[PDB]
């Protein structure tokens, strides 16, 4: 749980929330997926700014699954680790 | 390779670079780890702003390893998926 390890989620210009994707038939059973708080971003003044968007960050992760106990399966899944703020101007 | 899938790395206010952590004795053999481009962040005007820091985003991932071919090991490793911009003010 990074809600206990890293507090970046709350201090980001692109802050996010955590969602428990629970499942007993897969390992890790519980996964913390990040959903962006806003469309816009937190600027300097501390307002939501719609000249940039908070966007999620995906990552492919290996997982084990089981039938329902005699069968197991290694599979790759896509999980959203956090949010970053994208801009049109570079 | 997200250098081929997602181009956020280059459009982030907290842009990052990719590093190939290659290893034949582990699966996935090659891993793309994100190193932040700057300490500060890209503001509206498009300058690096030192009133906020670009910070990496860690995530624990399962991996397989092998001896050097008769032994294997499932282990959890910490990898940096990308960068977000943290601020003192909330």
């Amino acid at each position, epitope marked *: 749980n990074p809600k206990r390890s890293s507090d970046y989620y709350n201090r980001s210009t692109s802050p996010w929330n955590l969602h428990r994707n629970e499942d007993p038939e897969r390992y890790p059973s519980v996964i913390w997926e990040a959903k962006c708080r806003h469309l816009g971003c937190i600027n300097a003044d501390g307002n939501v700014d*719609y000249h940039m968007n908070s*966007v999620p960050i995906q990552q492919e992760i290996l997982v084990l699954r089981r039938e329902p106990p005699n069968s197991f399966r290694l599979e790759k899944i896509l999980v959203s680790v956090g949010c970053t703020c994208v801009t*049109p*101007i570079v | 390779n997200p250098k081929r899938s*997602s181009d956020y790395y280059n459009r982030s206010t907290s842009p990052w670079n990719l590093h190939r952590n290659e290893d034949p004795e582990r699966y996935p053999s090659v891993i793309w780890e994100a190193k932040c481009r700057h300490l500060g962040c890209i503001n509206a005007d498009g300058n690096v702003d030192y009133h906020m820091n670009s910070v990496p985003i860690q995530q624990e991932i399962l991996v397989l390893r092998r001896e050097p071919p008769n032994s294997f090991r499932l282990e959890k490793i910490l990898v940096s998926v990308g960068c977000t911009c943290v601020t003192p003010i909330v």
Partner: antibody
Amino acid sequence: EVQLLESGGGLVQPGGSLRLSCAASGFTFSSYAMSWVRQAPGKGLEWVSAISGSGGSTYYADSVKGRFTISRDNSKNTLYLQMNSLRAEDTAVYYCARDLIHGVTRNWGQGTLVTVSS
Amino acid sequence: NFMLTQPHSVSESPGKTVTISCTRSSGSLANYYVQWYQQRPGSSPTIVIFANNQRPSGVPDRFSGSIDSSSNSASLTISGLKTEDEADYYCQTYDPYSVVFGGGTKLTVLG
């Protein structure tokens, strides 16, 4: 070079249903907001719908809310538009656009003509 | 939903300067990016200006976007007119849930 190719256009009866497709190339499709814009024959441009890069954010013009449904297949580099309960007012050329952020539209498609008639 | 109002038609002789005004009602124009599009007879729209004043590939210094919130209006300008600039110009902006297009302005080159 960025290319947006619509398809699906056709003649449909009112109350009808139709599926526009837009095959994208020249960019990292998975990391871009997409838009569908229309233009009624002889009228101007009119925003229809929007979808985030992830597909977890979905936006709709009042007129098409509850009838049209935007979706994407980031795996196949294609953006879809499922039109149901098509009214005559939905006759137009639907163009497909790539948006930098939500709102800032950067590239446009060739367009596809949808005719809703009895 | 709010609205953008731009003049129906615009005229001028060549080599001159034309301003196409786009005036958004509810919401502050300063908070959201304005874009401009050109539409030639029979052709599909094309990006002219984006993020209030940026020009892409194939857009000369002749075209140039600008903004002014103390009246709440963004303005695309064309310095040094060419007969070949005759087309429909649309402004476009947004808000957290909607995207809005102008009614368009039909440019005309006298002479």
